[PDB]
Design a protein around this ligand. Sequence first.
Ligand SMILES: Nc1ncnc2c1ncn2[C@@H]1O[C@H](COP(=O)(O)OP(=O)(O)O)[C@@H](O)[C@H]1O
Lengths: 50, 50
Amino acid sequence: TASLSYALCPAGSRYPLFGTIILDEAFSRSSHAVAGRIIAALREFGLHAV
Amino acid sequence: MNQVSGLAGKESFILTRIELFNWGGFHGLHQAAIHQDGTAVIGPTGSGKT
Ligand SMILES: Nc1ncnc2c1ncn2[C@@H]1O[C@H](COP(=O)(O)OP(=O)(O)O)[C@@H](O)[C@H]1O
């Protein structure tokens, strides 16, 4: 997530112009307790994920 | 379907009990029972459950 956030950031700025990062069938080796971290973090970086 | 398992233990040797002593994150002696007919081992991430 950090990488794909960086790569989309236009030069100088740190708020990417394109926003819609997808995901699919992601959490098949983790507990509901830890997965709650990723969901909050992803939105924190500034992205917006289906 | 649960109670038919009783055949195992006559045609086969089934699992009954597992114990540890100073293994991994289990200090000292430790124990665990198991039933004749299917069980589960559940717990949150990072708990030695594998
Ligand atoms: N021999 C070991 N080497 C490194 N870490 C270990 C060892 N034994 C136990 N652990 C630790 O205990 C946990 C082992 O993971 P476990 O809880 O068995 O995995 P899972 O959550 O995939 O079932 C991890 O937190 C790991 O850091």
